């Protein structure tokens, strides 16, 4: 399997584009910067409001956790490679911190606004409009041999006021090289595609839409997340009844996989279950059949038929929000 575009981007590069390795990093001044207050905590990095005390600047100081040189070298590369990317949050500054010596990554401020209270409050044209702005950050990465790997609404920074959103956290993201096999645990579980779930490692930038379905679904539907699993296998099963069965099988077909004894029983026989039957009076104004064709063409198990983030973003339910911006 082969992404169906982009699969040459990094080919076509000088070597230094993608070995991140190879990067020395030229680090700045840790005192430059000072914490306001907390916004952010992961297992992988701790994230604060900062100031700029030189200018009195906001930004952000996301402060990583001890975690293997070369994974971090991966995320810096990719951030620099990524600079300037429409809604791509922009790296900086990259600075040791105080104590630890861990690096600490200095970004672009965002008054964003957790989505657990945001998207409640959007509106069936704000999520048309949000979804195109990710998107736009989307086909961007890829069109610049980058997967994120980790699409989710938790990183995605939106600052509801002045309506800017920026994608974040390229931690779990890599460079897409044609035919390497890559490692099934990325993204979060909610949002993670069948390839990942069935053990397909020759994986795309097709991970990223479905991440994306997954986040839209959970919008328009106001089922947060929409495929909850209890884990891997489970996450599985969640997604086959509603897909149904029978697409899981063509799907397995086609790239010859076949699921260990154990999932396989667990994820049993299902009929597919209509987008509609997820309508109900509290979703009612968000679910259009613009959303569900749009949704439906970016949750099919086959990585291969999902639409590509360039194709999503002309898809007729963004037709307004590309009208006001062709005006
Ligand atoms: N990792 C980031 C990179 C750039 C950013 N601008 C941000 C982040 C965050 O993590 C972040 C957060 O966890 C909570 C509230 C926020 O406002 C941000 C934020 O604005």
Not at 79 to 88: A, D, H, K, S, V
Not at 183 to 206: C, H, I, M, T, W
Not at 300 to 306: A, I, L, P, S, V
Request: charged share 30%.
């Amino acid at each position: 399997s082969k992404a169906r575009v982009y699969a040459d981007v990094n080919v076509l590069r000088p070597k230094e584009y993608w070995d991140y390795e190879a990067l020395t990093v030229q680090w700045g001044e840790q005192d430059d910067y000072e914490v306001v207050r907390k916004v952010g905590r992961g297992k992988y990095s701790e994230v604060f409001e900062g100031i700029n005390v030189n200018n009195n600047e906001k930004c952000i100081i996301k402060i990583l956790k001890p975690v293997k040189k070369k994974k971090i070298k991966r995320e810096i590369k990719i951030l620099q490679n990524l600079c300037g990317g429409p809604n791509i949050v922009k790296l900086l500054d990259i600075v040791r911190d105080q104590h630890s010596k861990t690096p600490s990554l200095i970004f672009e401020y965002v008054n964003n606004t957790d989505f657990k209270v945001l998207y409640p409050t959007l509106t069936d044209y704000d999520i048309r409009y949000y979804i195109y702005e990710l998107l736009k950050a989307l086909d961007y990465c890829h069109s610049q041999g980058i997967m994120h790997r980790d699409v989710k609404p938790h990183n995605v920074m939106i600052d509801h006021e002045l309506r800017k959103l920026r994608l974040i956290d390229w931690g779990l993201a890599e460079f897409y090289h044609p035919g390497k096999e890559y490692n099934v645990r990325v993204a979060s579980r909610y949002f993670k595609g069948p390839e990942l779930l069935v053990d397909l490692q020759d994986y795309d930038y097709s991970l990223d839409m479905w991440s994306l379905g997954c986040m839209f679904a959970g919008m328009i539907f106001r089922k947060e997340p929409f495929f909850y699993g209890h884990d891997n296998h489970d996450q599985l099963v969640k997604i086959a009844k509603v897909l149904g069965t029978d697409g899981l099988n063509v799907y397995l077909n086609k790239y010859r996989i076949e699921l260990d004894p154990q999932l396989e029983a667990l994820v049993g026989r299902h009929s597919r279950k209509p987008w509609l039957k997820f309508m109900n009076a509290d979703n009612q104004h968000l679910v259009s059949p613009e959303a569900i064709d749009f949704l439906d063409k970016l949750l099919r198990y086959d990585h291969q038929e999902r639409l590509t983030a360039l194709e999503a973003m002309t898809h007729p339910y963004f037709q307004q929000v590309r009208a006001a911006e062709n005006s």
